[PDB]
Subunit: 234 residues, 3 copies
């Protein structure tokens, strides 16, 4: 009900189907996406294409099931080509970064608005981001909610190519003709670059402090009222 | 004496004021910067802009006439420790060349807004010196490992243009631009910023020298080549290196 | 017999001279390179230029003591890694497979306009050592490394310059003039910086799952299918076993 699944050649296309909420991840969508990734190998598919219906790839969230989704993607023997058709924001950016490769629409952008919201990310989100946009641009994205445009994303390697869903499927079909064991090996080693990192004690303290703070409430109220937030640092 | 401090909106601008030596660091200047970083939170500032007076951001280290030159490297370590530990984001307004200790200082900032005119350089290979591990790892994270090799192995200058390319510069801009950005950042959720800063700084750049590193670090600093480079500059002639 | 060694100023130029096979590595070529790197400091040189004769820098591994060859190759990298001399790779053409590994083991790279770099391992069903993957990642950026490794995509010289894999675009002559400058720098500064830069964590032992997948790749029928398909000029039909 929340995703579409089709297969052409040896490519499985999984489409996020909550366009009315710009494909925000809820429970049912996260669960169905998990099952789809897990069952992806059951037929004859050798590559996956992951994309969103409508104008957004994924506008955010709407932690346990979510963590299991990332685990399923990280553990999958098949390469996932993200056809990032539009904005990938927050949990949506996380999802885009968990893809093995990325084909990005010219109007798509990437963003962690966490500093606007008073929240804090897990270490993997931060490390994978630094690896993909470079540490310097990661600092700006993390510390000041900077948007990463399709064009800058191509410049840094966050986007592998700029193009359409059709382009992503053409590339996925090529990839599906390559040697699956070579692909599996390279995927495992690359994912084990150290991005998958347990929070240090001081990170967890700061994480819990941010999440449990009064500023989280102030950010929601100001955004809901479309007015500038008066944060307190508590 | 050697630094200026103003506050506007919620931005604390700290200005290195030793323009006669192109803002080159020594004992006193480093001490006064440390204090200013540490005190920066007392009022209601939520961001720091760090910049230099005149044509230079910081051209390195001088130490001649410095009564406590011996304590310089330790006080410099303390400055870096204070910037790392500071809850506020530091926006480096790199108004001009950042060389040696100045590039280190620029890299310790959280964000960088760079003058079209500025460049970054580690001239260590010209002087026979060796860098701490952090300097090498933070540079690699900022310019990419490939460019970091050319910078360290051949004293390659990094222009503002290429700095923007790689991410070393987040923006090419003036002090004014840096300050407007800092004003925006000072309006974001301080506790989110605190978390991200700590995680980002804990990427592993802060790394203890391995035993072979320390061995090579001491051979370089202890070498006659270091003396030769200083003499050569002073005599305005190419240095004749010996590898000892 | 299989390398050329010349010295001008304080720059030793080592030339891979097997152009008929696009400078592909075999035991004798690896052994002679190893010796040339090891003894490069015996005279008065303080910088090394490494380059290929003809159109290619190094197209890969040949073999056609070939069971005593992966060991010899590891030794070449060790000697390059341990060398006090900075090695400027003049990448005069394609660097592929073991050629790409060799190019990355260089301290700096000056790359010809028509040169490209490539790991075609996913086309052949093979798996790389961890270092090849980590060092590639550091040089082209994690994103591009993913495309190169999961899809065998080539990296052109212009993109190499963009990422830092190429420090400059230029000729062998450019690389030699650059090396002559570096040879006038302080050797102990260079030695330290090289050691730390190489000790970035790229020299990584394979994790358990890395080794499992690596052995499974190298022992698979798919390696065979890849070869037979090339010899039959036809699409491979891999089985994932
Ligand atoms: C194996 C591949 C893999 C599996 C999971 C992740 C991320 C995904 C991200 C999600 F997408 F789910 F949002 N995510 N969100 C929260 C967490 C998380 O790890 N929480 C524990 C924690 C406690 C305290 C603290 F301070 C920091 N972290 C987490 N892991 C990345 C890669
Ligand atoms: C936590 C935040 C933080 C604190 C300090 C640093 C750097 C700054 C740099 C300076 F800017 F000061 F120059 N710097 N310079 C020298 C050292 C240093 O630590 N020396 C001990 C040592 C001995 C032998 C060896 F081989 C290498 N290192 C050192 N630390 C970076 C981050
Ligand atoms: C100190 C500087 C240094 C020395 C050697 C290397 C690489 C070079 C590369 C070559 F260019 F030779 F091909 N190479 N090839 C194979 C191996 C290797 O170490 N294999 C063991 C292994 C076990 C399990 C597994 F899963 C993968 N590999 C290996 N090491 C890198 C840096």
């Amino acid at each position: 009900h929340m995703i579409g699944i089709t297969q052409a050649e040896a490519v499985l296309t999984i489409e996020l189907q909550r366009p009315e909420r710009r494909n925000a991840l809820n429970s049912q969508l996260v669960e169905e996406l998990t099952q789809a990734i897990r069952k992806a190998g059951d037929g004859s598919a050798r590559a996956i294409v992951l994309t969103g219906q409508g104008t957004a790839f994924c506008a955010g969230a709407d932690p346990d099931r979510l963590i299991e989704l990332h685990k399923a993607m990280d553990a999958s023997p098949m390469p996932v080509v993200g056809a990032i058709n539009g904005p990938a924001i927050g949990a949506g950016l996380q999802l885009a970064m968990q893809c093995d490769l990325r084909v990005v629409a010219p109007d798509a952008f990437f963003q962690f608005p966490t500093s606007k919201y008073g929240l804090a990310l897990d270490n993997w989100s931060i490390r994978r981001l630094s690896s993909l946009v470079g540490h310097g641009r990661a600092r700006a994205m993390l510390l000041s909610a900077e948007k990463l445009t399709a064009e800058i994303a191509l410049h840094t390697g966050m986007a592998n190519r700029i193009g359409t869903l059709a382009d992503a499927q053409a590339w996925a079909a090529e990839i599906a003709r390559l040697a699956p064991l070579a692909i599996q090996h390279a995927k495992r080693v690359l994912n084990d670059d150290g991005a998958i990192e347990e929070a240090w004690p001081a990170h967890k303290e700061l994480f819990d402090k941010a999440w449990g703070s009064q500023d989280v409430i102030e950010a929601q109220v100001a955004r809901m009222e479309k007015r500038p937030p008066k944060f307190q640092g508590a």
